Design a binder for this molecule. Structure first.
Ligand SMILES: Cn1cccc1CNCCc1c[nH]c2ccccc12
Ligand SMILES: Cn1cccc1CNCCc1c[nH]c2ccccc12
Length: 330
C-alpha cells in the first residue's frame, strides 16, 4: 500500500503545516500537524475542556462505530516549546492520503495548553518519530507509520514541505519526480527516539563551506533551524544590524535586509536554504524588527533541523530495520 496527502502552511509565515487525516467511521476529518519530533497522535475531541477549544475541529469517538476506549490508558506530553496536552485513549481507524491503519491509538485530549487553544488551525498532532517516545501509559502505543509499515510497498515516508505553498507527505514510496539530482542518505541514531543525524557542515551565503559535524534531529514539527551558537553567530554577522535580543528571545534583523542563504551538508552533498526562507517577519505588527529563522540551540540541548531547513529539501524518512535519512534538492 501507499498514501499521499497534501500538507498546507497554517499561515503566511509557514509557522507549521497541517495535513487532513480521516479518523473513525464514518470518517471525521481533522487537520493534524505531522511531527517527526514526537510519537503521539492526539486530537482535540468531545472530551477537551470546553474553555480550551477555540475553533478547532474535534473528534467525537461516540459518533464512530469503530472507536473503542483503550481501557485504563492515559497520555501526557510536553513539547520543546513548553506546550503540553494530555488525556485518554481510543483505538480507531485512521487514514492518511488513502493509506488506512486499523486499531490506531488516537489520543483524545482532555487538556491542552494555551498555544494549542490559540492555534485554531491545528486540530492535533500526528507523531512520526520512533514509537519509543510515545507517552501512553501503562501500555506504550505505536505511531501511525509503525503500524502501517508492514503493509507499505517500501518502509518509508517522505516530507516535501513548501515555501509559502502546499507540499506533500507520501507513505510507502519515493516520488522520483519530486526532487532534482540524487538523494543522499545519511546514518540515523534512534537512541533518543528521534530521527537524529549528523550534518557535515555549513556555509553562509557565498562563503566557503566549513566542514564540521553537527548532530541534530530532523523535525517537521518545529518551525525554525536551531544550531550551535558559533554557527548562528557566523550567519547573523553577515546581516547588517542583526542582533540577539534577550527581550524578544533570539536573533532579530532589520526588516529592510536582504538575507544570505544558508547551506548545510549531508555527506558530500549540500542543501541550500534561500535567504527568504529565513525571514519570519515583524516581531509584532508594524515593527521594522524581523525575527530570524536560524536561532541558537544553546539551552535546548539538541540541534534541530526544523521546517526552515527541511522545506529546502525532499526528505526521506527510511524506516527500514536500520533507519536512515535521505535529502535531495528540489
Ligand atoms: C519566536 N517568536 C518571536 C516573536 C514571536 C514569536 C513566536 N511566533 C509563534 C508563531 C506561531 C504561531 N502558531 C504557531 C504554531 C507552531 C509554531 C509556531 C507558531
Ligand atoms: C508544539 N506545537 C506544535 C504545533 C503547535 C504547537 C504548540 N506551540 C505552538 C508555538 C507557540 C508557542 N507559544 C505561542 C505559539
Amino acid at each position: 500500500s501507499t498514501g499521499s496527502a497534501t500538507t498546507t502552511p497554517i499561515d503566511s509565515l509557514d509557522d507549521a503545516y497541517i495535513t487532513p487525516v480521516q479518523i473513525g467511521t464514518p470518517a471525521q476529518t481533522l487537520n493534524l500537524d505531522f511531527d517527526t519530533g514526537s510519537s503521539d497522535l492526539w486530537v482535540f475531541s468531545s472530551e477537551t475542556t470546553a474553555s480550551e477549544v477555540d475553533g478547532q475541529t474535534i473528534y467525537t469517538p461516540s459518533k464512530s462505530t469503530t472507536a473503542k476506549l483503550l481501557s485504563g490508558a492515559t497520555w501526557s506530553i510536553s513539547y520543546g516549546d513548553g506546550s503540553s496536552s494530555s488525556g485518554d485513549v481510543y483505538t480507531d481507524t485512521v487514514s492518511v492520503g488513502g493509506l488506512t491503519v486499523t486499531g490506531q491509538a488516537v489520543e483524545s485530549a482532555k487538556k491542552v495548553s494555551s498555544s494549542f487553544t490559540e492555534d485554531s488551525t491545528i486540530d492535533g498532532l500526528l507523531g512520526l518519530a520512533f514509537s519509543t517516545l510515545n507517552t501512553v501509559s501503562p501500555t506504550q502505543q505505536k505511531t501511525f507509520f509503525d503500524n502501517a509499515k508492514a503493509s507499505l510497498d517500501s518502509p518509508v515516508f517522505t516530507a516535501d514541505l513548501g515555501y509559502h505553498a502546499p507540499g506533500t507527505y507520501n507513505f510507502g514510496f519515493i516520488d522520483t519526480t519530486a526532487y532534482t539530482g540524487s538523494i543522499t542518505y545519511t546514518a540515523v541514531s534512534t537512541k533518543q527516539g528521534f530521527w537524529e543525524w549528523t550534518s557535515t557542515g555549513y556555509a553562509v551565503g557565498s562563503g566557503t563551506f566549513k566542514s564540521t559535524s553537527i548532530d541534530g534531529i530532523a523535525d517537521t514539527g518545529t518551525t525554525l533551524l536551531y544550531l550551535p551558537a558559533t554557527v548562528v553567530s557566523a550567519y547573523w554577522a553577515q546581516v547588517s544590524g542583526a542582533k540577539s535580543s534577550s527581550s524578544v528571545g533570539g536573533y532579530v534583523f532589520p526588516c529592510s535586509a536582504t538575507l544570505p542563504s544558508f547551506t548545510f551538508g549531508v555527506g558530500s552533498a549540500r542543501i541550500v536554504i534561500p535567504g527568504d526562507y529565513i525571514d519570519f517577519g515583524p516581531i509584532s505588527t508594524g515593527s521594522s524588527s524581523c525575527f530570524g529563522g536560524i536561532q541558537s540551540s544553546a539551552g535546548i540541548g539538541i540541534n534541530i533541523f526544523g521546517d526552515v531547513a527541511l522545506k529546502a529539501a525532499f526528505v526521506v524518512f527510511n524506516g527500514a530495520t536500520t533507519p536512515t535519512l535521505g535529502f535531495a534538492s528540489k
